[PDB]
């Protein structure tokens, strides 16, 4: 479980208003800690976790300046992209970026990334070597040539290997009481009506952190992902998460099935079954 710092940028054009909106969020692991929204009056980078509030005005000023610049660059970019794709001004289009760093066990960059999408499809991405780009279509090759000409990749690599990692370590210290403590799931099995073919068993995992978890159903030593409904992991609202897995089983045969829960807050996987 290597820690990570990641930023998620979304820019959307608004032809009815003749403008665009830019939204940025930052995460450490699965915990959001900052946001920026170009639609806010006098928009600033804003704290979204308690442990980041100890940063002084120099931090918030410098973060605000960078996000204001990025917001303007992405607005102008939406117009360039509309040109590249032969699109009219009637519709709304979406430009996204995500980037971040994972911290290796030696304190060095384990994996850095920076990628971009247009209308929800991969556009251009920094390669694993942090030195070159891969472009998805002919429009993206325009950007790629411009970014090669300007030696952008070298500047991204310096960020990902340097400031990104350094700030991650600092954040991890600042919020160590919450970011560095795993909360195990509280678990239980419920039973519900289904149809003629049997009863539903639902295995719950509640209030865990971080988000990564495995819920599996088994019958007599054999996986049941075949017929099981597995919901997307969802936020509790307090910074922890929830998930469940359900399976229709023959009436009277509930005890032949076990739910198995792997989470890094547990010393060993939990095994549970309907009482």
């Amino acid at each position: 479980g290597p820690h990570s710092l990641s930023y998620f940028y979304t820019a959307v054009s608004r032809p009815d208003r003749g403008d665009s909106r830019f939204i940025a969020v930052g995460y450490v692991d699965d915990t959001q800690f900052v946001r920026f929204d170009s639609d806010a009056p006098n928009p600033r980078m804003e704290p979204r976790a308690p442990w980041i509030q100890q940063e002084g005005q120099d931090y918030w000023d410098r973060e605000t300046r960078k996000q204001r610049d990025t917001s303007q660059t992405y607005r102008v970019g939406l117009k360039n992209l509309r040109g590249y794709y032969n699109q009219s001004e009637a519709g709304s289009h979406t430009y996204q970026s995500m980037y971040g760093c994972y911290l290796g066990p030696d304190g060095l960059l384990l994996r850095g990334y920076r990628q971009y999408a247009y209308d929800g499809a991969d556009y251009i991405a920094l390669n694993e070597d942090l030195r070159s780009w891969t472009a998805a279509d002919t429009a993206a090759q325009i950007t790629k040539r411009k970014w090669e000409t300007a030696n952008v990749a070298e500047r991204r690599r310096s960020y990902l290997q340097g400031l990104c990692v350094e700030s991650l370590r600092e954040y991890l210290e600042m919020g160590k009481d919450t970011l560095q403590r795993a909360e195990p799931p509280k678990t239980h099995v419920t039973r519900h009506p289904s149809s003629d073919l049997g009863v539903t068993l639902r295995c719950w995992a509640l209030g865990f952190y971080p988000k990564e978890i495995s819920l599996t159903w088994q019958r007599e030593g054999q996986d049941q992902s075949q017929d099981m409904e597995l919901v997307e992991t969802r936020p509790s609202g307090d910074g922890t998460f929830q998930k469940w897995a359900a399976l229709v089983v023959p009436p009277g045969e509930e005890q032949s099935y076990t739910c198995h829960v792997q989470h890094e807050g547990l010393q060993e996987p939990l095994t549970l079954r309907w009482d």
Binding site: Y7, A24, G26, V34, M45, Y59, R62, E63, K66, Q67, D69, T70, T73, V76, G77, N80, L81, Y95, Y99, R114, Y116, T143, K146, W147, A150, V152, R155, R156, Y159, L163, C164, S167
Partner: peptide, 9 residues
């Protein structure tokens, strides 16, 4: 800290 590298598409 967010990236200062912002380049026009």
């Amino acid at each position: 800290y967010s990236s200062d590298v912002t380049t026009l598409v």
